Amino acid sequence: AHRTLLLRLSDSGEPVTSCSYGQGVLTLPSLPLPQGKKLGDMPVYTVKLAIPAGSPVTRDGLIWTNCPPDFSTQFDREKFYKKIIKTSFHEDDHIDLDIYVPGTYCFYLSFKNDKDELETTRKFYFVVLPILSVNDKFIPLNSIAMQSVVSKWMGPTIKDWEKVFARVASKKYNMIHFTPLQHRGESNSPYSIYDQLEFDPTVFKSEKEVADMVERLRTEHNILSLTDIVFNHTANNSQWLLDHPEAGYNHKTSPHLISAIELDKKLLDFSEQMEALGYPVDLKTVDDLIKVMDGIKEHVIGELKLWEFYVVDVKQTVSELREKWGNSKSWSDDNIPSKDDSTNLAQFVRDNATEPGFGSLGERGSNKINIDKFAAILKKLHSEDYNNGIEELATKILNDINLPFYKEYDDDINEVLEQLFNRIKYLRIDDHGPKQGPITKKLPLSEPYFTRFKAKDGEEYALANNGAIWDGNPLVDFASSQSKAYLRREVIVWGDCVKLRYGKGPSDSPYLWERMSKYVEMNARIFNGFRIDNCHSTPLHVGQYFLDVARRVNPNLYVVAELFSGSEAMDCLFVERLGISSLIREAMQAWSEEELSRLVHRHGGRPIGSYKFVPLDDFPYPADVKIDEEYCAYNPDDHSVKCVSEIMIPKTLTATPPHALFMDCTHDNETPNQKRTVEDTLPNAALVAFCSSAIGSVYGYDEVFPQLLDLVQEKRTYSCAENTGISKVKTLLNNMREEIASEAVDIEDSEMHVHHDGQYITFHRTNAKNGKGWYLVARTKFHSSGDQMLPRIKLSQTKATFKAAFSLERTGDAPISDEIIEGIPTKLRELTGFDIGFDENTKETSILLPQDFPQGSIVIFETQQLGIDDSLDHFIRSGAIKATEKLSLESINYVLYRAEQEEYDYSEGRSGAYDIPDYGKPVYCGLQGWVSILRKIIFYNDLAHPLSNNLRNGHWAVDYVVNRLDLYKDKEGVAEVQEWLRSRMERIKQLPSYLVPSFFALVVGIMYGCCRLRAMQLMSDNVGKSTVFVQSLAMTSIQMVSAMKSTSILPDQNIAAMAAGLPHFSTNYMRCWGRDVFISLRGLLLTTGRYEEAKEHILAFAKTLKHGLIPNLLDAGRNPRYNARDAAWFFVQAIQDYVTIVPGGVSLLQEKVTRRFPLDDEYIPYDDPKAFSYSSTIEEIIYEILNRHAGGIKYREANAGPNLDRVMKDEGFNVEVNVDWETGLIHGGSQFNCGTWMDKMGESEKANSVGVPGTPRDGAAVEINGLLKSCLRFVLQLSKDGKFKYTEVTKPDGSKISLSSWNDLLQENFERCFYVPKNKEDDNKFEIDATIINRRGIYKDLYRSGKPYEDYQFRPNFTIAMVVAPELFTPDYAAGAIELADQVLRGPVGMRTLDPSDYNYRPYYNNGEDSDDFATSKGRNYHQGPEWVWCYGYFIRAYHYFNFLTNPKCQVEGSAKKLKPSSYLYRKLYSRLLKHREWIENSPWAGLAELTNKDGEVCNDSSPTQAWSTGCLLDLFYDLWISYEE
Amino acid sequence: NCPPDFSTQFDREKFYKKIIKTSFHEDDHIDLDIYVPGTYCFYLSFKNDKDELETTRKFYFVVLPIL
């Protein structure tokens, strides 16, 4: 059905962690195949790789993976296959990886570097677990009960073994671990294997004899089998080692151990002549050690010639200096140090005159000097004649060269004998170790470090035997040349075994790899899995090759390994590459009760009430996605991985900690009788069995054997004594886990609470789906610590049921047999007296233990959380899609957003945002305010967060979500969304308090995802199919467009009105701004598809035309402020954008609006009948603006005086505009004016700036004339199509100019007036006074403004003209000017409003500055440095356009040979939007700020989300979409 | 020093990169589009047998004017 997982990748190709489960491995969940399907019928899993759009990896990117393309193809570690990444700047690419067989798989990415070179990422691994079934019943991996049995203690016959099989089958183990069933070596230790290719001749004879026994275990007792596999060593007496001695490290293969070989056999010879030479044989005196050690110093240490292995032979070098003194013909270099620096000269010879392998170990005299180059250094430093003091100089140099070697020798020798007299004590003197037998041939003073034998090639070899360094790094091969452990005697050896020298591959040991390969696949044909002892000491590439050979034979190979590497990270890497299925953990390692409770806490599960993952505001919501409309397209027989909700965003693949196999006692650790007591066997095994993982035990733990069995010596056989000790309890524990395994699946589905009080350990296992659970109280018996009483156990909102209780008591000592291993007689007494009190009011269960509860006892309770049934998850994960069926792009604003001021508008100031105690209020009142806070909480499972605390302290926030929508119930689809929230929040309140936070975030997250998907469906295709970043920008359109009560865009009704920004521009007269509305109209409404809403805003402002101008401050159409010369031209540009984009948009020109202001610019007759007087089509409204500007306008503002602007001066109210017809551009403004978007009016009385505008832009503004040129070009082509009827234009005198002549006037004079040429000679054509200048190659900011230096200022306003009127610019002039803005004026997120090199540059904005600074106080800085985000949009839109026309590297051929931008330009565009994508990701408000201080510094006064800040970035994506993505 | 397109002016000392597609079987062909008459030259940079950088002579060719 649906077995697909989504693995999202970062911009560098690394997998994204959806949750913080800790250091882990990308593991896929173990699930059975669909009903009646085998391996090959269909892919086991499909990993959907998600590559971000426009990421640097997409540039000629390829996905590599060693996954075979189909089931017929075998798996190869190093054969990777190609996959093409479909690059796009809008849409992410999804590439499927079909997996047909479990195993180890990795993937890496190759792409084109920014240096046009090839680059590769890391290899990223993911493991598909094997499928374990017995007959036809699936065995979940975390329900495995493993019984480890040793072969040589089960009887000499097969039926003697099948009696042991029946005993462990009665205890209901489902898996048996075998010590290797091969022919054992001399010492008969199970791990020193004589021959790997044939089994034990005592019991078996062929593969079919043992294969039938394992298959018999499967069919008879329903038990799977696995063995140990030994890679690191073999027995010291293998007949194939005589044929192939190179399989281990010898004097030929590993020459560095030659020094250690002679030390071993010199100590063994001293053991032969020990008291024969001296006196101490085997005494227990501290002096006896010292005297024998003094014999070692004089008979073996002092008998190897001072060890020339390090030191250069001094006199044998001088002897080899006179022999050929003359072939060496001096030197010519002058770098040789003089005899003054006696040490720098010593090492200078070491670097130039040395044979290969100097300093390292080899033969006896491996380190020697190149004679021919040494004498050449001597001759050029002293003399060419030898007798001239060369013997003294050459010896002085060589003696200094051996100074570090001699001190390297004293530090080595000290560790040789210090290690000796420390082990021989423990080896002989009873410190804690016995066997102080007089030094025998079998028990010499030195344990054999090397196995000596005469090979079939006649020669003699010395293969050593592996072991373990005390506290050394196991990742280092101590037999390799990098270690000096065999020399310094830092090795605890195993004489039973012998080295196995693998190299870099089969080329270094051909027969060893061929033999181990046939030995691995032999057991792979028979058994279900392997067990690897000391896997950390086996090299990676060695373990990788053979485990893949086994998986080719047995595709469902189950791998266990005792892995204790350097850290958890190294543990995960071994699990990643080797494909380890489970790690062995030992419960006997716990020294105390607190260490045991912490071990069980690690492998028990997740905390109770843990958060559940949900797709939130960090996912793409494609409008074309399949949906489970009622979470019903699932069948249990399909065994499909479930999506999170009704939306079919597949289950995410995230790193989870590697699976564990918790062993209460292995075959290497001491018995509970030894380390603790026998009574602890019951509570210890119960705590382990309760862990949510695989469990195991060694045979004898349940049968309470007295002491750990010696794997080497002991020959006694297991007892036939049935049902001894814990065998009855293990039957109960394994049978209980069989019931739980049927429904518990993923890591979020099993929760746990563990408590430790003195000698008691509490374990509470809980299933998160149904509420079923177990409660375990186990009193541990580490030692007889006396009587301790446990406090009252209290469970909230839970009912308890007594299951079983037992006590383990010792009845004396164990029998002493010599032919059978018998355990200690034990009584298993059932306990009673547990009082389970239940308060039918508080729904609280109390549990009181009985006083007869001795140490070594347990008691199990069946528990069930109240309010949770099996049908709870389905009710929460369904219905939300149907509930959002009637939502609109306006109504979603009330469900998701609404600022507190916006909410106060609907609630008259009564409601607002929920106040979280000890935290604050969410940013929005809707779900976005919750999701912005919950995303980090769910990621870290922060159950201690103030919101998490409040959610379980009461149901206030739960009811706050549902009661909010009463304000907006009458809106489209909000009532049905509220009812879904009401029904789901009501069911949640019936749950335990501690579970409310996890379920509250789940209900909110599901409805949020359904609301965000519904938005993408109602929007256009370019948005509804794009990256998270584009959709996040599109969601800002819903944040701004809302219906209000205190304001609107129409004076008669209350409809949807786009806010300027939240929360500072949302209520009353502060919401709508004509300049702000129509700059963001194309991005927030046209790019998104809000055509009808974009028409309403054009018509509403068309009603308030006056003086041929559109008002900036719109008071919903009653008494609007006409202090703007920018708005009228941004308004007429939005009309062009509407007609260009909207299909049939020409119909807007003939739409009649009710002109509610008289044509003769009258006063404010809002209530007069002359308001509704006359109508006006948009066609004549456009012409009314063009003709009124040309015919000249002259007026003082209506209602002039302080009642409007209480700081604007008297002369400031009389603004005005006219056109200089020698150039054709529009002037206007004064030094007391703010008619542009940089409208910051001073108000500081302490700084003497009241009424002085911070940025008056009087005269010709670049944006105004650029939009004027865009309007003229628009109406000219419109008249050509019969849609515009006007070409006449009146002048103040009476003259007429055709619209084309005015259009040509700008084309001939615009660039001439504004461009500042970089050529100092071309100043005579572009009208420039070079005295007041800053940088040339710049387009002006103003023409003939009040202060002439403000004309020649670098400001980002010229880019508005570059975007709307590109014909006014010669390409080479514009490209160089916009390149300066990129280097100088471009900030990280915002565009610098003023050149930093200017003297007026103050980039920090503080609207509360109470100082005497004439430029900074009370916010006069507003547009003199601070970085605005919307100007970045217009900047990059023209930066893309003019780099595409000028730079040849920004073009590439394509569809119909039409030039599309190269990946070099997309790369430059993508890099300039990373700070914008970071901003909207890590902001509580889901948008882009209005303003930013210098260099990304957050401005507190700036509105955190602005309409035109995000709308101008949506304009860029529409340019690249509407022009190339066809 | 051949300009990549007609928009780019000619500079004597501004040279542009071109990648040689190395093969042991197939020769590589690299086009030089010339839009305006003048003096143009080309030289080659490669990895020496000493793993160092080496450069050949500048080789010129003249595009005659159109009269």
Ligand SMILES: OC[C@H]1O[C@H](O[C@H]2[C@H](O)[C@@H](O)[C@@H](O[C@H]3[C@H](O)[C@@H](O)[C@@H](O[C@H]4[C@H](O)[C@@H](O)[C@@H](O[C@H]5[C@H](O)[C@@H](O)[C@@H](O)O[C@@H]5CO)O[C@@H]4CO)O[C@@H]3CO)O[C@@H]2CO)[C@H](O)[C@@H](O)[C@@H]1O
């Ligand atoms: O209800 C009728 C209304 O009539 C009159 O309105 C006038 C205002 O009183 C008067 O101050 C002025 O408003 C201007 C403003 O002066 C001008 O600079 C510009 O807006 C700027 C602010 O200047 C600037 O400081 C900043 O203010 C933000 C602030 O940064 C933000 O952090 C947060 O605190 O919100 C503040 C705004 O509330 O930014 C804004 C936007 O860039 O334009 C304004 C409108 O023209 O002129 C008004 C003319 O009607 C009465 O005076 C007023 O009391 C009445 O309520």
Ligand SMILES: OC[C@H]1O[C@H](O[C@H]2[C@H](O)[C@@H](O)[C@@H](O)O[C@@H]2CO)[C@H](O)[C@@H](O)[C@@H]1O
């Ligand atoms: O004791 C007051 C109680 O209310 C607090 O804050 C919220 C409340 O939960 C909502 O119902 C809201 O409508 O009123 C307050 C905010 O205006 C705390 O949530 C709660 O813990 C506290 O005890």
Ligand SMILES: OC[C@H]1O[C@H](O[C@H]2[C@H](O)[C@@H](O)[C@@H](O)O[C@@H]2CO)[C@H](O)[C@@H](O)[C@@H]1O
């Ligand atoms: O009035 C302020 C002043 O700021 C800048 O002055 C520049 C000057 O023009 C340059 O020659 C520069 O080297 O020195 C000053 C900055 O350190 C503006 O260029 C100037 O127009 C403006 O008036």
